[PDB]
Amino acid sequence: PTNVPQRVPLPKGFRTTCFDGYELIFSNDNYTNGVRVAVDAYPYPVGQCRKCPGGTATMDGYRCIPCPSGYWSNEGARECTACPAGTIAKPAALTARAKYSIDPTTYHFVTHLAMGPESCKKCPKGYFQPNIAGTVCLPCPSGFVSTSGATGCTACSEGTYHTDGVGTTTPGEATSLDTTDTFGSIYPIIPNTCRQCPANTYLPLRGQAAIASMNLAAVSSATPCRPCEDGTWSKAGAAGCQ
Protein backbone atom coordinates (compact mmCIF):
# COMPACT_ATOMS: atom_id res chain seq x y z
CA PRO A 1 0.00 0.00 0.00
CA THR A 2 0.91 3.68 0.00
CA ASN A 3 3.53 4.74 2.54
CA VAL A 4 3.11 8.06 4.34
CA PRO A 5 6.20 10.23 3.73
CA GLN A 6 8.27 11.77 6.48
CA ARG A 7 7.96 15.40 7.61
CA VAL A 8 9.69 16.92 4.60
CA PRO A 9 9.32 20.74 4.52
CA LEU A 10 6.30 21.74 2.47
CA PRO A 11 4.63 24.97 1.35
CA LYS A 12 1.59 26.28 3.18
CA GLY A 13 -1.56 24.32 2.36
CA PHE A 14 0.32 21.35 0.86
CA ARG A 15 -1.78 18.56 2.33
CA THR A 16 -0.16 15.13 2.18
CA THR A 17 -2.66 13.19 4.35
CA CYS A 18 -6.27 13.97 3.49
CA PHE A 19 -9.00 14.01 6.11
CA ASP A 20 -11.46 11.17 6.57
CA GLY A 21 -13.99 11.22 3.74
CA TYR A 22 -11.83 13.13 1.22
CA GLU A 23 -9.20 12.10 -1.31
CA LEU A 24 -5.83 13.50 -2.35
CA ILE A 25 -5.60 15.51 -5.58
CA PHE A 26 -2.82 17.52 -7.23
CA SER A 27 -3.84 21.03 -8.28
CA ASN A 28 -2.86 24.67 -7.82
CA ASP A 29 -6.44 25.90 -7.34
CA ASN A 30 -7.96 26.78 -3.98
CA TYR A 31 -9.76 23.86 -2.30
CA THR A 32 -11.52 24.24 1.05
CA ASN A 33 -13.75 21.51 2.52
CA GLY A 34 -13.28 19.51 -0.67
CA VAL A 35 -14.90 22.09 -2.98
CA ARG A 36 -13.01 24.69 -4.97
CA VAL A 37 -13.58 28.34 -4.12
CA ALA A 38 -10.91 29.97 -6.33
CA VAL A 39 -9.03 29.02 -9.49
CA ASP A 40 -5.21 29.00 -9.64
CA ALA A 41 -4.55 30.31 -6.13
CA TYR A 42 -1.04 28.81 -5.91
CA PRO A 43 2.09 29.53 -7.98
CA TYR A 44 2.65 25.79 -8.41
CA PRO A 45 0.50 22.65 -8.19
CA VAL A 46 -0.12 21.49 -4.63
CA GLY A 47 -1.42 18.32 -3.02
CA GLN A 48 -4.89 19.12 -1.65
CA CYS A 49 -8.09 17.41 -0.52
CA ARG A 50 -11.38 16.95 -2.37
CA LYS A 51 -14.66 15.45 -1.18
CA CYS A 52 -15.55 11.95 -2.29
CA PRO A 53 -18.06 12.19 -5.15
CA GLY A 54 -20.89 10.57 -3.22
CA GLY A 55 -21.54 6.87 -3.45
CA THR A 56 -17.91 6.28 -2.44
CA ALA A 57 -16.18 6.13 0.92
CA THR A 58 -12.66 6.08 2.32
CA MET A 59 -10.75 5.96 5.59
CA ASP A 60 -7.17 6.32 4.36
CA GLY A 61 -8.05 9.36 2.25
CA TYR A 62 -5.81 8.37 -0.66
CA ARG A 63 -8.61 6.98 -2.86
CA CYS A 64 -12.41 7.31 -2.99
CA ILE A 65 -13.24 3.61 -2.88
CA PRO A 66 -16.57 2.94 -4.63
CA CYS A 67 -19.17 1.61 -2.22
CA PRO A 68 -19.50 -2.20 -2.30
CA SER A 69 -22.58 -3.61 -3.99
CA GLY A 70 -25.51 -3.50 -1.59
CA TYR A 71 -24.41 -0.25 0.09
CA TRP A 72 -24.68 3.49 -0.52
CA SER A 73 -23.16 6.71 0.76
CA ASN A 74 -23.43 10.48 0.44
CA GLU A 75 -20.65 12.95 -0.35
CA GLY A 76 -17.62 12.78 1.93
CA ALA A 77 -18.60 9.59 3.76
CA ARG A 78 -16.04 7.70 5.83
CA GLU A 79 -17.99 4.44 5.45
CA CYS A 80 -20.86 3.19 3.31
CA THR A 81 -24.28 2.51 4.84
CA ALA A 82 -26.11 -0.69 3.97
CA CYS A 83 -29.48 -0.67 2.27
CA PRO A 84 -32.22 -1.85 4.66
CA ALA A 85 -33.91 -5.22 4.45
CA GLY A 86 -36.31 -5.59 1.54
CA THR A 87 -34.34 -3.18 -0.66
CA ILE A 88 -31.52 -3.42 -3.19
CA ALA A 89 -28.80 -0.83 -3.77
CA LYS A 90 -29.26 0.02 -7.45
CA PRO A 91 -26.26 2.07 -8.63
CA ALA A 92 -27.10 5.08 -10.78
CA ALA A 93 -25.49 5.00 -14.21
CA LEU A 94 -22.93 7.74 -14.81
CA THR A 95 -21.97 9.61 -17.97
CA ALA A 96 -18.29 9.87 -18.87
CA ARG A 97 -16.68 13.26 -19.41
CA ALA A 98 -17.49 14.75 -22.80
CA LYS A 99 -14.27 16.79 -22.68
CA TYR A 100 -11.08 16.75 -20.62
CA SER A 101 -11.73 20.42 -19.80
CA ILE A 102 -14.69 19.35 -17.63
CA ASP A 103 -14.22 18.68 -13.93
CA PRO A 104 -14.42 14.89 -13.45
CA THR A 105 -16.75 13.08 -11.08
CA THR A 106 -14.82 9.85 -10.42
CA TYR A 107 -12.21 7.64 -12.05
CA HIS A 108 -12.65 6.60 -15.67
CA PHE A 109 -13.17 2.91 -14.86
CA VAL A 110 -16.06 3.67 -12.45
CA THR A 111 -19.33 3.73 -14.38
CA HIS A 112 -21.96 3.11 -11.68
CA LEU A 113 -22.48 4.66 -8.25
CA ALA A 114 -25.05 4.46 -5.44
CA MET A 115 -25.37 8.22 -5.19
CA GLY A 116 -27.99 8.60 -2.48
CA PRO A 117 -30.32 6.98 0.04
CA GLU A 118 -33.06 6.82 -2.60
CA SER A 119 -30.93 4.28 -4.48
CA CYS A 120 -32.26 1.69 -2.00
CA LYS A 121 -35.12 0.43 -4.18
CA LYS A 122 -37.74 -1.99 -2.89
CA CYS A 123 -37.96 -5.52 -4.25
CA PRO A 124 -41.01 -5.97 -6.50
CA LYS A 125 -44.01 -8.07 -5.55
CA GLY A 126 -43.12 -11.75 -5.79
CA TYR A 127 -39.52 -11.18 -4.66
CA PHE A 128 -38.03 -10.73 -1.20
CA GLN A 129 -34.74 -9.41 0.19
CA PRO A 130 -34.32 -11.21 3.54
CA ASN A 131 -31.18 -9.62 5.02
CA ILE A 132 -29.42 -6.30 5.44
CA ALA A 133 -26.98 -5.17 2.73
CA GLY A 134 -28.78 -7.34 0.21
CA THR A 135 -27.59 -7.50 -3.38
CA VAL A 136 -30.26 -9.42 -5.34
CA CYS A 137 -34.06 -9.56 -5.24
CA LEU A 138 -34.48 -13.23 -4.39
CA PRO A 139 -37.43 -14.86 -6.19
CA CYS A 140 -39.93 -16.17 -3.67
CA PRO A 141 -40.12 -19.98 -3.36
CA SER A 142 -42.93 -21.75 -5.17
CA GLY A 143 -46.06 -21.86 -3.02
CA PHE A 144 -45.36 -18.61 -1.15
CA VAL A 145 -46.43 -15.03 -1.89
CA SER A 146 -44.82 -11.70 -1.01
CA THR A 147 -45.71 -8.02 -0.97
CA SER A 148 -43.64 -5.02 -2.08
CA GLY A 149 -40.25 -4.87 -0.37
CA ALA A 150 -40.97 -7.86 1.86
CA THR A 151 -38.39 -9.52 4.11
CA GLY A 152 -39.67 -12.99 3.36
CA CYS A 153 -42.87 -14.37 1.87
CA THR A 154 -45.72 -16.37 3.39
CA ALA A 155 -47.19 -19.53 1.92
CA CYS A 156 -50.62 -19.72 0.33
CA SER A 157 -53.45 -21.10 2.45
CA GLU A 158 -54.63 -24.71 2.44
CA GLY A 159 -57.41 -24.33 -0.13
CA THR A 160 -55.39 -22.13 -2.48
CA TYR A 161 -52.33 -22.67 -4.67
CA HIS A 162 -49.67 -20.30 -5.98
CA THR A 163 -50.18 -19.07 -9.55
CA ASP A 164 -50.88 -15.92 -11.54
CA GLY A 165 -53.83 -13.73 -10.59
CA VAL A 166 -54.70 -11.89 -13.80
CA GLY A 167 -58.41 -12.70 -13.58
CA THR A 168 -58.86 -12.44 -9.82
CA THR A 169 -60.24 -9.42 -7.99
CA THR A 170 -56.92 -8.46 -6.34
CA PRO A 171 -53.94 -9.38 -8.56
CA GLY A 172 -50.81 -9.56 -6.45
CA GLU A 173 -48.54 -9.31 -9.49
CA ALA A 174 -46.06 -6.45 -9.48
CA THR A 175 -46.68 -3.64 -11.94
CA SER A 176 -44.40 -2.77 -14.84
CA LEU A 177 -43.41 0.48 -13.09
CA ASP A 178 -41.57 -1.29 -10.26
CA THR A 179 -40.11 -4.08 -12.42
CA THR A 180 -38.93 -2.73 -15.79
CA ASP A 181 -38.60 0.95 -14.83
CA THR A 182 -37.18 0.87 -11.30
CA PHE A 183 -34.89 -1.94 -12.48
CA GLY A 184 -33.85 -3.10 -15.92
CA SER A 185 -34.83 -6.47 -17.35
CA ILE A 186 -33.10 -8.28 -14.47
CA TYR A 187 -36.33 -8.80 -12.49
CA PRO A 188 -39.41 -9.67 -14.59
CA ILE A 189 -42.97 -10.04 -13.33
CA ILE A 190 -43.44 -13.17 -11.21
CA PRO A 191 -46.83 -14.74 -10.37
CA ASN A 192 -47.51 -14.24 -6.66
CA THR A 193 -51.25 -14.92 -6.30
CA CYS A 194 -53.15 -17.63 -4.43
CA ARG A 195 -56.06 -19.07 -6.42
CA GLN A 196 -58.65 -21.35 -4.85
CA CYS A 197 -58.93 -24.90 -6.10
CA PRO A 198 -61.95 -25.47 -8.38
CA ALA A 199 -65.13 -27.31 -7.43
CA ASN A 200 -65.00 -30.99 -6.43
CA THR A 201 -61.23 -30.67 -5.87
CA TYR A 202 -59.32 -30.24 -2.63
CA LEU A 203 -55.80 -29.27 -1.59
CA PRO A 204 -54.63 -30.35 1.89
CA LEU A 205 -51.02 -29.13 1.53
CA ARG A 206 -49.96 -25.71 2.75
CA GLY A 207 -47.44 -24.54 0.16
CA GLN A 208 -48.48 -25.55 -3.35
CA ALA A 209 -47.84 -23.94 -6.73
CA ALA A 210 -49.21 -24.69 -10.18
CA ILE A 211 -46.51 -26.63 -12.03
CA ALA A 212 -45.77 -24.85 -15.31
CA SER A 213 -44.06 -26.40 -18.33
CA MET A 214 -42.15 -24.00 -20.57
CA ASN A 215 -42.95 -26.17 -23.62
CA LEU A 216 -46.69 -25.57 -23.86
CA ALA A 217 -46.95 -27.36 -27.21
CA ALA A 218 -46.15 -30.82 -25.82
CA VAL A 219 -46.94 -30.64 -22.08
CA SER A 220 -49.49 -28.21 -20.69
CA SER A 221 -49.20 -26.61 -17.27
CA ALA A 222 -51.13 -28.39 -14.53
CA THR A 223 -52.38 -27.45 -11.08
CA PRO A 224 -51.82 -29.57 -7.94
CA CYS A 225 -55.52 -29.53 -7.00
CA ARG A 226 -56.17 -33.13 -6.00
CA PRO A 227 -59.48 -34.63 -7.17
CA CYS A 228 -61.92 -35.68 -4.48
CA GLU A 229 -62.30 -39.40 -3.82
CA ASP A 230 -65.36 -40.92 -5.46
CA GLY A 231 -68.37 -40.70 -3.19
CA THR A 232 -67.15 -37.42 -1.68
CA TRP A 233 -67.74 -33.87 -2.87
CA SER A 234 -66.18 -30.51 -2.08
CA LYS A 235 -67.13 -26.91 -2.77
CA ALA A 236 -64.71 -24.67 -4.64
CA GLY A 237 -62.30 -23.77 -1.86
CA ALA A 238 -60.65 -25.47 1.10
CA ALA A 239 -59.59 -29.10 1.46
CA GLY A 240 -61.47 -31.96 3.10
CA CYS A 241 -64.13 -33.19 0.70
CA GLN A 242 -67.38 -34.00 2.49
Ligand X SMILES: *[C@@H]1O[C@H](CO)[C@@H](O[C@@H]2O[C@H](CO)[C@@H](O)[C@H](O)[C@H]2NC(C)=O)[C@H](O)[C@H]1NC(C)=O
10-29: contacts with ligand X (CB under 6 A): 13
- The stretch near ligand X (CB under 6 A) out of 31-39, 107-115, 124-132, 227-235 is 31-39
Nearer to ligand X, 27 or 200 (CB): 27
CA distance 76 to 54: 6
Distances (CA, A) of 133 to 58, 60, 184: 18, 23, 20
> Is residue 180 classed as helix, strand or coil in its secondary structure?
helix
Give, in degrees to the nearest 5, the angle at Cα 32 between 28 and 33: 135
CA nearest 153: which of 135, 138, 140, 137? 140
Please answer whether residues 146 and 126 qualify as being in contact, where contact means their C-beta atoms are separated by less than 8 angstroms.
yes
- The stretch near ligand X (CB under 6 A) out of 37-45, 148-156, 158-166, 182-190 is 37-45
Minimum CB–partner distance for residue 28 and ligand X (Å): 10
Minimum CB–partner distance for residue 13 and ligand X (Å): 5
The amino acid occupying position 192 is N
- Determine the straight-line distance between the first and last CA of the chain, rounded to whole angstroms: 76
Nearer to ligand X, 40 or 118 (CB): 40
Residue 177 is classified by DSSP as I
Contact between 32 and ligand X by CB under 6 A: the answer reads yes
Nearer to ligand X, 14 or 183 (CB): 14
Minimum CB–partner distance for residue 12 and ligand X (Å): 7
Minimum CB–partner distance for residue 140 and ligand X (Å): 54
> Is residue 141 classed as helix, strand or coil in its secondary structure?
coil
Q: Of 19, 28, 41, 182, which lies in the binding site for ligand X, with binding defined by CB under 6 A? A: 41
Minimum CB–partner distance for residue 31 and ligand X (Å): 8
In sequence order, the β-bridge partners of residue 195 are 161
- The stretch near ligand X (CB under 6 A) out of 36-44, 155-163, 181-189, 213-221 is 36-44
Nearer to ligand X, 37 or 186 (CB): 37
Nearer to ligand X, 30 or 182 (CB): 30
Give, in degrees to the nearest 5, the angle at Cα 40 between 39 and 43: 165
Total of chain residues touching ligand X, rule CB under 6 A: 6
Contact between 38 and ligand X by CB under 6 A: the answer reads yes
Sign for the CA dihedral angle at 192, 193, 194, 200 comes to: negative
CA nearest 142: which of 209, 194, 206? 209
Minimum CB–partner distance for residue 33 and ligand X (Å): 8
Contact between 37 and ligand X by CB under 6 A: the answer reads yes
Q: Which parts of this chain interact with ligand X (CB under 6 A)? A: 13, 30, 32, 37-38, 41
